[PDB]
Structure 1
Amino acid sequence: VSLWERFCAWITSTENRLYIGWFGCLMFPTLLTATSCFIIAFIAAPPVDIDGIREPVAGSLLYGNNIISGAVIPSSNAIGMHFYPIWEAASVDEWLYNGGPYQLIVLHFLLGVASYMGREWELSYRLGMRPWIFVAFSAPVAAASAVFLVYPIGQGSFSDGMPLGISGTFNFMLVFQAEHNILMHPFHMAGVAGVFGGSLFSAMHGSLVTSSLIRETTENESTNYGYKFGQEEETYNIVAAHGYFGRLIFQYASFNNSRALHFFLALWPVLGIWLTAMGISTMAFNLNGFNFNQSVVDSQGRVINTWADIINRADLGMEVMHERNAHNFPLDL
């Protein structure tokens, strides 16, 4: 045989501790470089001028932060959507002043997660499985891409992306609420229903399966020891569990098929997350949620308020105080 054939046989081998595959060639370097840069920048980075008004903001541990308030600041507003690699700065100090590491981390990270999906499919193929797990994983990837890349593209600046921090996430959420009126977009309601229903069904399924265990342990050992690796037993007792579910609610509602059950379980949260990601992506292009301000009037013509007006007051309060020194003109276009 040749050298290339041996290399290919080693790459696609299903006997290593961790599968490599051809997608792993793009996966591993990008994720590793993103991790290294993120750790170093989170620990020891200097303040970054995020808004382009020459007012740097500290975000690293060594400059007086804690775990909660630390972050990696997005790039400067003066840059916009321009590409800013290291070799385009006159010095490393200038590169760090304008928020260089954010772009590097984000780009290598997104490439890494795409390769992660590909690698999942590849191992599924090599193991003789059915190839539909990476489709399920595509939803968190879609949401992360939506925020990190799509929102800056629509708004025209990397500085509007979500900061890589804990309190930066809250700041992003609050400003997004103030500017786009989320919580009134039906796609956000779809996402909330998705997560709540996912938690509900996880708890219900766990309870039902755990309650229907046959007797193999008696008292003085954890019940988990009954199951053996490779044992043959369907994940319930049909009589007890089916009767319990058919008696708890009306008898017409009971899943007697494991396939349909475990399909519904997979389908619900994935669809919810897809819809909420598309909601964020569409709101990136200034298509906001429902507007119900001053919609109820009496006979004379005066305005009677509703709860939407209280929400509007909160939105105005958030809006008038964000980026205090950044605006010069009456409209925030």
Structure 2
Amino acid sequence: NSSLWARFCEWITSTENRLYIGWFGVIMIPCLLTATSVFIIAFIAAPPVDIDGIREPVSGSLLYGNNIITGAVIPTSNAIGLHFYPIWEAASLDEWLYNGGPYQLIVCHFLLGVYCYMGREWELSFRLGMRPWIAVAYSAPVAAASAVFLVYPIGQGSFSDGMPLGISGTFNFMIVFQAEHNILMHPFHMLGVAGVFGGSLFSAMHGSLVTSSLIRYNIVAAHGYFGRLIFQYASFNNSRSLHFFLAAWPVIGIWFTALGLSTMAFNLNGFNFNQSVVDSQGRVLNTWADIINRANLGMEVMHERNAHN
């Protein structure tokens, strides 16, 4: 009880700290702290990186003429591919900067930190008597982040295909998908959009009804309003089922969209309705899918450099 190990265990496991630590805490704290430190330093004063591996460096640091919107941390070089490139493997620190190691450092440490945050959620929930199913809800954003940052590069074969840590980087990321894989027509992205929009709708409407009902009745009063507003009597008359539905809709939507991105990593595709309507004599009549395909074709042609010096 008084052993140094016992004292350390009690301190780590104590719930009287302002922020609970736990063992998942002891793992995640250094990881996330290193990630954020390196992220800030690279965002502020990082030198150019050759993302494409054709000796055409891309500047993304603030000191090199950039704003908040246009700045980012460029992913690793295409030459490294999917290899492991730690700091002590590069010939010199300058070469390490030129190739783009800090992206790998950030992504690895951040992924470990988020997983251990997931674990710590359950740990604290268990230390207090709560039920343990908040980690399941948190799995959706964690799954999406893991997909985008780790599974897509593995499928494509290089870390240069990951999402740059920025804003304009994210926009370029989205545009390159819409050029290459036709994400907009993939059913899983449709389910993700539906999940997000339905979550916003349900949040707004639940807030409205609950605030209206609360008078200086919480569910038996507003239910009369809802049953006659848009019909649909006796749908969610149990206060627990309603909140479970709220927790379930967006989580399932995000799970499906993450699985869709993971499947695209192995490159099946979105839907493809090109030239799906033809009259007699074999002539082709254009549909909206053809206009979308023209936009995608222009996008893809613009992206590819092909002639690289």
Q: Which whole-Å CA distance do the structure 2 matches of 1:269 and 1:278 have between them?
A: 14
Over residues 109-142 of structure 1, what are the superposed CA-to-partner deviations in whole Å (9 max), with x where a residue is unaligned? 0000000000000000000110000110010000
CA contact (8 A) 1:245 1:254 kept: no
SS at match of 1:321: helix
Contact 1:198–1:265, Cα closer than 8 Å, also in 2 = yes
> CA separation in 1, counterparts of 2:243 and 2:151?
33
How many residues matched?
307
CA distance in 2, matches of 1:281, 1:326: 30
* Structure-2 separation of matches of 1:214 and 1:66: 48
- The C-alpha deviation readout for 1:68-114, integer Å capped at 9, x for no partner, is 00000000000000010110111111100011100000000000000
Residue pair 2:51, 2:77 contacting (<8 A) in 1 also = yes
Tell me if structure 1 keeps the 8 A contact 2:49–2:57: yes
Correspondence for 1:14 = 15
Q: Note the C-alpha offset of 1:325.
A: 4.6
How far apart, CA to CA, are the structure 2 residues paired with 1:242 and 1:188?
33
Shift of 1:250: 1.4
Could you list the runs of 5+ residues in structure 1 that have no partner in the other structure?
216-235, 329-333
Deviation for aligned residue 1:14: 0.7
Q: Closer, same or farther in 2 for the Cα pair 1:298/1:325, shift >3 Å?
A: closer
Among residues 294, 313, 326, which one is paired with 2:294 in the alignment? 313
* Partner Cα distance (1:53, 1:115) in 2: 38
Change (3 A) 1:326 1:13: farther
Change (3 A) 1:319 1:253: farther
- Measured at CA, do residues 139 and 251 of structure 1 come closer, stay the same or move farther in structure 2, by a change above 3 Å? closer
1:290 to 253, 261, 271: 271
Q: 1:142 to 1:326 in 2, by over 3 A?
A: farther
Per the TM alignment, residue 10 of structure 1 is displaced from its structure 2 partner at its CA by 1.0
Distance between the aligned counterparts of 2:188 and 2:29, measured in 1?
A: 34
Q: TM (normalized to structure 2)? A: 0.97
User: Which 4+ residue blocks in structure 1 deviate beyond 6 angstroms?
Assistant: none
Which residue of structure 1 aligns with residue 200 of structure 2? 199
- Change in CA separation of 1:311 and 1:323 when aligned onto 2, cut-off 3 Å: same
Once the 2 structures are TM-superposed, how far is the Cα of residue 214 of structure 1 from its aligned partner?
A: 1.5
Check whether the contact 1:34–1:105 (CA below 8 A) recurs between aligned residues.
Answer: yes
Classify 1:238/1:45 alpha carbon distance in 2 versus 1 (closer, same or farther; 3 Å). closer
Q: Deviations over 1:184-225 (max 9, x none)?
A: 11000000000000000001100000001222xxxxxxxxxx
Shift of residue 19 of structure 1? 0.5
Range moving further from structure 2, 256-265 or 239-248 = 239-248
Q: Give the Cα–Cα distance (whole angstroms) in 2 for the partners of residues 67 and 238 of structure 1.
A: 45
Structure with bigger gyration radius: 1
Q: CA deviation at 1:251?
A: 4.6
CA distance in 1, matches of 2:219, 2:49: 61
Q: State whether residues 53 and 326 of structure 1, in contact with CA within 8 Å, keep that contact through their aligned partners in structure 2.
A: no
C-alpha displacement at 1:25, in angstroms?
Answer: 1.1
How many Å separate the matches in 2 of 1:136 and 1:316?
38
Q: Work out whether residues 190 and 276 of structure 1, in 8 Å CA contact, stay in contact via their aligned partners in 2.
A: yes
Q: Quickly say closer, same or farther: Cα 1:107–1:298, change in 2 above 3 A.
A: same
Q: Does the 8 Å CA contact 1:77/1:157 hold for their aligned counterparts?
A: yes
Cα deviation, residue 270, structure 1: 0.0
**Cα distance in 1, alignment partners of residues 173 and 195 from structure 2:** 22
1:65/1:238 CA distance change after superposition, 3 Å: closer
- Quote the sequence identity (%): 91
Superposed CA offset, 1:276-306 (max 9, x none): 0000000000110111111111111100110
* Deviation, structure 1 residue 9: 1.0
Q: Note the C-alpha offset of 1:3.
A: 1.3
User: Is residue 2:101 matched to residue 1:100?
Assistant: yes
Q: Could you tell me the TM-score, scaled by structure 1's length?
A: 0.90
Q: Secondary structure at the match of 1:33?
A: helix
Post-superposition Cα deviations, 1:116-170, rounded to whole Å, max 9, x if no partner, equal 0000000000001100001100100000000000000000000000000100000
1:51–1:326 Cα contact (<8 Å) kept: no
Shift of 1:256: 1.3
Mean alpha-carbon deviation: is it higher for 246-255 or for 316-325? Answer: 246-255
Deviation, 1:252, is 2.5
Match of 1:219 in 2: none
